[PDB]
From a paper:
To elucidate the molecular basis of rabbit ACE2 binding to SARS-CoV, SARS-CoV-2 PT and Omicron BA.4/5 S proteins, we solved the cryo-EM structures of rabbit ACE2 in complex with S proteins of SARS-CoV, SARS-CoV-2 PT, and SARS-CoV-2 Omicron BA.4/5. Q34, a unique residue of rabbit ACE2 compared to other ACE2 orthologs, plays an important role in ACE2 recognition.
To unveil the structural mechanism of SARS-CoV S recognizing rabbit ACE2, we solved the cryo-EM structure of SARS-CoV S in complex with rabbit ACE2. As the resolution of SARS-CoV S/rabbit ACE2 could not meet the required resolution for interface analysis, we further solved the cryo-EM structure of SARS-CoV RBD/rabbit ACE2 at 3.25 Å, allowing the interacting residues to be clearly observed. The SARS-CoV RBD also binds to rabbit ACE2 in a classical pattern. The H-bond network is centered in Patch 2, except for a H-bond between Y83 and N473 in Patch 1. The ACE2 residues involved in H-bond interaction largely resemble those in the PT S/rabbit ACE2 complex. However, Q42 forms a H-bond with Y436 of SARS-CoV RBD, but it is not involved in the H-bond interaction with PT RBD. The other H-bond network involves Q34, D38, Y41, and K353 of rabbit ACE2 and N479, Y481, G482, T486, and G488 of SARS-CoV RBD. The SARS-CoV RBD bound to both rabbit and hare ACE2s with similar binding affinity in comparison with the SARS-CoV-2 PT RBD. However, when S: ACE2 = 1: 3, although two RBDs are in the up state, only one of them is bound to rabbit ACE2, indicating a transition state where the ACE2-binding induces the erection of the adjacent RBD while the second ACE2 has not yet bound. The structures of SARS-CoV S complexed with rabbit ACE2 revealed a correlation between the proportion of ACE2 in sample preparation and S protein conformation, indicating an ACE2-induced RBD erection pattern.
Author numbering:
A (entry chain B): 329 to 500
B (entry chain A): 19 to 614
Write the structure that this text describes.
């Protein structure tokens, strides 16, 4: 159901669920949920639509980035870490984890990518850590004009409201 | 390859790393400030050293990328802001020499001792005793000896260091292809943009003087009234028409005249509103005070404070005995964390200071969406100017009656308004000539126009030409008079105060004019009026992403500084002064001095 360990963005967790029926109707009197949206349906067609062969994508992001998990919404990480399709719409559910994933001394176990050659197609996953060079010439780091493509977020406890670790699950 | 991609990647990397280093340093500093020990200083110094090392190593490393070939204004502005770093372009030995000179200067200023008037054992320093003796004494000799002794110590202890430091700073500035250090200081107001929106730094001297000639008549109308009201205090010591002696201004140097209200009062038979009472009787506290401040701010249309502000920020003296300074301040630590550190009380000054600090925090949250290198004010005056209009609006009797701290049948008495206006003018107006003088003298020193052996004398000349203050004792070239000031011993800019003072009244006039308020401007309260808040927020969000001329144009409508609102604010005070002064107000002539 739920796990105490969550992966990062460019290592997002993918789960395939089949032959199962879920309701999650507790969302009426559920103040625990920070944000909940549905794009494909507005729960009107839920009566005549059974769930089968669904995908669950899980990761941890920043608050200001939760709006980026949607069709369009260029942003920065929506084109380099996780790209949303235009047609296949499910639902998005993001909740706050300030009290468990944030420590007063620091938490640097979550990474993200901000440099790439070319755009990202939907369902494209990039893992390889190759040095990034803006003008070809395969570099030998740490030579000049030869940067690293990765960074760490650094969620702490005493941050703001949008700079907190939000756990995000997309149901497709 | 193309320069643009290189600059973009470098800027992305710099923002990436700064967003972490700055937060670590700020958190260490806050942890030290909330609890003083001998161990938190080490952590704070470690974080600060790491951040400074990274910033210095990355600042003057992209100079390989020229600033002339950039096409967007965003990337060009970021590169221009990053390139100017300072002494890092100089040799290591020169940097160490400058750092040692600065450390010696700050240390020798901080540990001043003054010991006279009796058997020499009692050392008052500055902060424990000199501020109080300046702000409370009504005796001439005590103030004179304090002034002269403090200057005769610090100036002669500091002058050679400044003499070498100006030369080395000029050489360092020349290393960066500038022409002097004063040009480097005034380069903050340099802005480039559209055809009519550009601003050259050489134009600064043209602007600042042009406005000052328009403030000269009002200031003098104040300068007379104080003088003719000191005859009652000191019988035959201050000249009927001469300049005011330097050490009788209620402060050590003369930055503010705010402590002379007790000597100069229009009508002593009537008191001021809620002066330290009715809050003991009604039973308020810090939480209610901040809640009312938040209520006032939401009634205009600006966003309310976040919960983290209530949870993390301390709002009263700690009950665990931990030692803090708790000088009130508003901290923006980055990553969306804003806090207020202030020891609360049940006085009116705390009531107004809460609103002032809440206005800076509002400005802090205004431009949090801009990129890292541009998250600042439009210039060095906007940030301080934004937070004072709230204090101006909060003190009007309309709001005090609306809250309930005043009786509903208490009318707006004739004497109270002019008392309030006089007390405000005792602080706002009197600080402008002093700032103008300080900045002009330092710029002239850095320009090299005045030779090395004619510094101090020239300084005193300006005292008689702009502000009208005469030195109480003769000073030769050995002294260093501005070295006694805190902002000069630790070198900082000064014109920001002038700019702030003009901008705040421009903003208030614009907002009230948008508020459909009929009558004088002193009874202005933007409560129950969203237009003023909308117009102000239309400017707060820009940050430093646009030249400051466009930032100012968005609310006031003009592209430069205008002084008409400031004179319009004190119009009833102006008329009252011209009616009361059947003498004086005929200027000052610079030949009368206390010693000759
Ligand atoms: Zn302030």
């Amino acid at each position: 159901f739920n796990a105490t360990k969550f992966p990062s963005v460019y290592a997002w967790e993918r789960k395939k669920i089949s032959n199962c029926v879920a309701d999650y109707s507790v969302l009426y009197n559920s103040t625990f949920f920070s944000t909940f949206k549905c794009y494909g349906v507005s729960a009107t067609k839920l009566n005549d639509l059974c769930f089968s062969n669904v995908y669950a994508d899980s990761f941890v992001v920043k608050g200001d980035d939760v709006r980026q998990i949607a069709p369009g919404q260029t942003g920065v990480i929506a084109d380099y870490n996780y790209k949303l399709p235009d047609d296949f719409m499910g639902c998005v559910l993001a909740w706050n984890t300030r009290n468990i994933d944030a420590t007063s001394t620091g938490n640097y176990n979550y990474k993200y990518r901000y440099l790439r050659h070319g755009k990202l197609r939907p369902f494209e996953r990039d893992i390889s850590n190759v040095p990034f060079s803006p003008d070809g010439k395969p570099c030998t780091p740490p030579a000049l004009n030869c940067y690293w493509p990765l960074n760490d977020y650094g969620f702490y406890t005493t941050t703001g409201i949008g700079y907190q670790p939000y756990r995000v699950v997309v149901l497709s | 390859s193309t320069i643009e991609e290189l600059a973009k990647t470098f800027l992305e990397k710099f923002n990436q790393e700064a967003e972490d280093l700055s937060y670590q340093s700020a958190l260490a500093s806050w942890d030290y400030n909330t609890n003083i020990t001998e161990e938190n200083v080490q952590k704070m110094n470690d974080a600060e050293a790491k951040w400074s090392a990274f910033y210095e190593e990355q600042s003057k490393l992209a100079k390989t990328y020229p600033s002339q070939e950039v096409q967007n204004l965003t990337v060009k502005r970021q590169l221009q802001a990053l390139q100017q770093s300072g002494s890092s372009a100089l040799s290591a030995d020169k940097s160490k020499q400058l750092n040692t000179i600065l450390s010696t200067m700050s240390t020798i200023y901080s540990t001043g001792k003054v010991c006279n008037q009796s058997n020499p054992q009692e050392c008052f320093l500055l902060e424990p005793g000199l501020d109080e003796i300046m702000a409370k004494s009504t005796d001439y000799n005590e103030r004179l000896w304090a002034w002269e002794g403090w200057r005769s110590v610090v100036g002669k202890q500091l002058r050679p260091l400044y003499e070498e430091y100006v030369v080395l700073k000029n050489e360092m500035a020349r290393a960066n292809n500038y022409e002097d250090y004063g040009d480097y200081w005034r380069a903050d107001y340099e802005a480039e943009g559209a055809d009519g929106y550009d601003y050259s730094r050489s134009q600064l001297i043209d602007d600042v003087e042009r406005t000052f000639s328009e403030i000269k008549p009002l200031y003098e109308q104040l300068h007379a009234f104080v003088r003719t009201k000191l005859m009652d205090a000191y019988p035959s010591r201050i000249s009927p028409t001469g300049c005011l002696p330097a050490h009788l201004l209620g402060d050590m140097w003369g930055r503010f005249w705010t402590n002379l209200y007790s000597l100069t009062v229009p009508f002593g038979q009537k008191p001021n509103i809620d002066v330290t009472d009715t809050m003991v009787n009604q039973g308020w506290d810090a939480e209610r005070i901040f809640k009312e401040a938040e209520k006032f701010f939401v009634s205009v249309g600006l966003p309310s404070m976040t919960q983290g502000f209530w949870e993390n920020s301390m709002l009263t003296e700690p009950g665990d005995g931990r030692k803090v300074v708790c000088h009130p301040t508003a901290w923006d630590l980055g990553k969306g964390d804003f806090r207020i550190k202030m020891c609360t009380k049940v006085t009116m000054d705390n009531f107004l200071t809460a609103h002032h600090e809440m206005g800076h925090i509002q400005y802090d949250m205004a431009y949090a969406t801009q990129p890292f290198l541009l998250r600042n004010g439009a210039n060095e005056g906007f940030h301080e100017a934004v937070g004072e209009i709230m204090s101006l609006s909060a003190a009007t009797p309309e709001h005090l009656k609306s809250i309930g701290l005043l009786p509903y049948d208490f009318h707006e008495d004739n004497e109270t308004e002019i008392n309030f206006l006089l007390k405000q003018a005792l602080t706002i107006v009197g600080t402008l000539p002093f700032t103008y003088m300080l900045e002009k003298w330092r710029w002239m020193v850095f320009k090299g126009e005045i030779p090395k052996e004619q510094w101090m004398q020239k300084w005193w000349e300006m005292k008689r030409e702009i502000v009208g203050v005469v030195e109480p004792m003769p000073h030769d070239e050995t002294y260093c008079d501005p070295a006694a000031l805190f902002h000069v011993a630790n070198d900082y800019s000064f014109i920001r105060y002038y700019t702030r003072t003009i901008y705040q009244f421009q903003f208030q006039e614009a907002l009230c004019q948008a508020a459909q308020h009929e009558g004088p401007l002193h009874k202005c309260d933007i409560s129950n009026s969203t237009e003023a808040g909308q117009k102000l927020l239309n400017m707060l969000r820009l940050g430093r992403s646009e030249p400051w001329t466009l930032a100012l144009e968005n609310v006031v409508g003009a592209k430069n500084m205008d002084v008409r609102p400031l004179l319009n604010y004190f119009e009833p005070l102006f008329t009252w002064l011209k009616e009361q002064n059947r003498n004086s107000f005929v200027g000052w002539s610079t030949e009368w001095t206390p010693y000759a």
